[PDB]
Symmetry: C4
Amino acid sequence: SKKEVCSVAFLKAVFAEFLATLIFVFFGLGSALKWPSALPTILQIALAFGLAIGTLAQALGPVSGGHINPAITLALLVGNQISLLRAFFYVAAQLVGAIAGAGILYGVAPLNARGNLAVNALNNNTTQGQAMVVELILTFQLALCIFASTDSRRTSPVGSPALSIGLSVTLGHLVGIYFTGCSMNPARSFGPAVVMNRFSPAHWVFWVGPIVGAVLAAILYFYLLFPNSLSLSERVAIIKGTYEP
Amino acid sequence: SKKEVCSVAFLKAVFAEFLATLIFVFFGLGSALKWPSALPTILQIALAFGLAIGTLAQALGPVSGGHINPAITLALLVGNQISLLRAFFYVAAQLVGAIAGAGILYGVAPLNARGNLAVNALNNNTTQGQAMVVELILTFQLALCIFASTDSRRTSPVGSPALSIGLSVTLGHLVGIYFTGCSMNPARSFGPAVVMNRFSPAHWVFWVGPIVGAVLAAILYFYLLFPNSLSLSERVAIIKGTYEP
Amino acid sequence: KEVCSVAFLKAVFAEFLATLIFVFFGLGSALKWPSALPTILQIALAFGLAIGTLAQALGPVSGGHINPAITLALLVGNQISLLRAFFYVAAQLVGAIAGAGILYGVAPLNARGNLAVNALNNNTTQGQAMVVELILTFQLALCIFASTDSRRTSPVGSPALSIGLSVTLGHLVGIYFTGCSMNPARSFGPAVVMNRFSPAHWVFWVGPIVGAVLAAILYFYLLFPNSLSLSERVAIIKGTYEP
Amino acid sequence: SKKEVCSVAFLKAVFAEFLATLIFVFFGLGSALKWPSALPTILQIALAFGLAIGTLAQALGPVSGGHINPAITLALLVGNQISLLRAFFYVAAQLVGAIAGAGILYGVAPLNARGNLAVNALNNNTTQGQAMVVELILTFQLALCIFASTDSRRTSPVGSPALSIGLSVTLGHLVGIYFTGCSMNPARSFGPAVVMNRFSPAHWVFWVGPIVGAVLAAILYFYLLFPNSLSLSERVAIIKGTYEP
Ligand SMILES: CCCCCCCCCCCCCC(=O)OC[C@@H](COP(=O)(O)OC[C@@H](N)C(=O)O)OC(=O)CCCCC
């Protein structure tokens, strides 16, 4: 744990997530601004967020896990895949990341296109609870795809974990956008909300629905469909980050 | 088979065939809703349906084979690929899943969006028989792609079965939406048709079209082009669930 | 020899069958549906995805040419035999006719129009069009040849999807000039089905074939040649090369 | 090095780079013309430019490395793993094919759609600095993904390096077009310019932004994240072109 956190490997892994979430938020928000020029369409926006995740999973996945999402990091914590300290620093990183990325976009978009910087937001004729359950489901399917696409034990041809995973997030947007703007990711939500100093009463849903959805997926997969056999000592070791590097 | 049906893995498989179809119908109908906000276009809808199955195939395929469609399950039966009891259970789980999927969406979509909850629906301009033959074609190429994509034997690079298969679905909507709203799957149709007690006519088309095209592709793939060498009796054994290779 | 084989007979039926479905999907996806006129990207992905799928699905039976221009190219590149090429191109053409027909008999009157036949940009001359078609079919073919080279050591990802998106790419430019053929069978099929042969039709044979053949010679002779010996190359053509 | 510059393969590679850039400029420019017949939309264009690279990468990458972009060539020079001279002819070949490809479209494009020939051009609401940061960031993610997808030491599944790389350029277009019309490639910007005699006052952006972001991605990836054991001065044998005989 002191050994874990005090790796260059770890320092790198923490940096990869910051920079990944930075780049991810830049691109995702940037693609959804109401460019007067040409106003982004549902499909355009959904493939933009997804290709962002596919591209960063591919490019930086090797360095950290390519989590780029506090809900999937907390989930992976629940599923006994990472140490407590990895989860914590990752979430920080993703949140700091999300804010810097939103930061740079604010900085470079014309007055014209800045709008409210693509903050998530309800349909208005959509209720909070609804929002809440839609987001649970959007995130649930993503996590599942994620756990399945990176399981070292998987026997069937995996294809491209990166593109399956990114296109899974475009699928999420293809419905999510109509309910909430589509969060699926507490950091994607936090970022614009900070930077701009815009927080809606519903903002909590963008934290709750994603995390609960991911964690439900983590409990289903890792402990119901494909549990492994380790000792409580080894389980403990994971959480205390002692099990191994 | 007593030992087959009662096994824990089977109980997972049936759960997964249920879980998927539900999630698939959720995203499927949900992306197809006449959102006043921005009407889904046709590429929009097709990509959402394709990436749901692709996603789902990646995620729960290693659990059940991830049929997520009666036509295909039925066709793997006929092709001597699965046991009669995995076939009945798979179909039942699918039909119920689709119902719950239409069910959660119904309760989640705003009244302005709900509409007829994306039920299939032959175009006034087209004969049933007309409809019947395109849903035949549409599920024929899906079936072929699936079998080809998921065969043990195949020596040529398969790439991504899940993404290949997913985009097979998408392709099918690019033509299919124009005649029937693209069925290619008895449960996707039966689902919404149930949550709304408004089945409509030609619905049979949505059963026999897909199932026939599926079955035809089994015939050709498994008995015409790439037959197996299973014993005359070995076949009965896969029918009963006692086969062991 | 070949022909007289259940292997070669299955192949050819594969090419017939694949072209059918390919043509059905391509054309019906390009018809003028009044509820929603098929857009350019929409159309490009229907053609692209059809080939992606058919090659994934039927590719192991035949090699999935689904294109007389490719087949001839392979011949020229010494990758297939003379009879192989004869019978396939044969099959593709009739398979395409078949596919246009099934669609013609199935599309609603208000949709049928055209029937998605290839057709020149009006402000485009046949020579202009000839070069574009050349080019469109050139990139596609070397996508094919590189993606099905057994000597390839670089990870090939998905040859099927790479090749399908290759088609898609051709449409995104090509549709604006010629409606994008890239495939004489594709253009031949609806034309037979609805008489109406264009005065530019030759473009739709010559352009795609020349461009593919150019790519065949580039890749198999200039880029990635084999050792195959004079007499052993001729056995390639006579459909008796083992090795 | 006369060792490699005089090789028949160097020859083939220098030439493929020419051929690939040519075809890539033909297609990207060609897709993005206004075309009154049907104005190309943003995603339409994002996909065209992307599938062009993913295609050409697949086709011609084993011949040359398929850089098709002076910014990524120079970055590969910066991060080591190509020689100075390979870099010179590659960048020379890219600029000539770009011009070569822009010319052939000019020759082929009908009057009412030619324009312009799809030159890059700042948003008038966009600051040259602003546009530069954006281009920096756009090529940075692309260059990062390229390096990650072509690293021989990579262990986790790479999926399709060609289609990832391809979808990465598509990603960068879905934001970049609204800003600079999306360069990410000095050669794409240079080609049409030469042919139309249009060097916008902000031309510098299309080179320096893309080349910085690239080099930056190459420094991080090669020298910080995934450093190679060797070192030392067999690095100058890299530069000199005489390494690993
Ligand atoms: C609307 C427009 C949107 C466009 C969507 C575009 C998305 C298209 C998706 C294409 C991605 C295809 C990915 C794709 O084709 O990936 C294919 C796999 C090949 O698997 P494998 O046998 O090498 O790995 C071992 C395997 N048995 C296992 O199980 O691990 O990629 C790899 O992992 C390596 C590639 C090397 C090839 C020699």
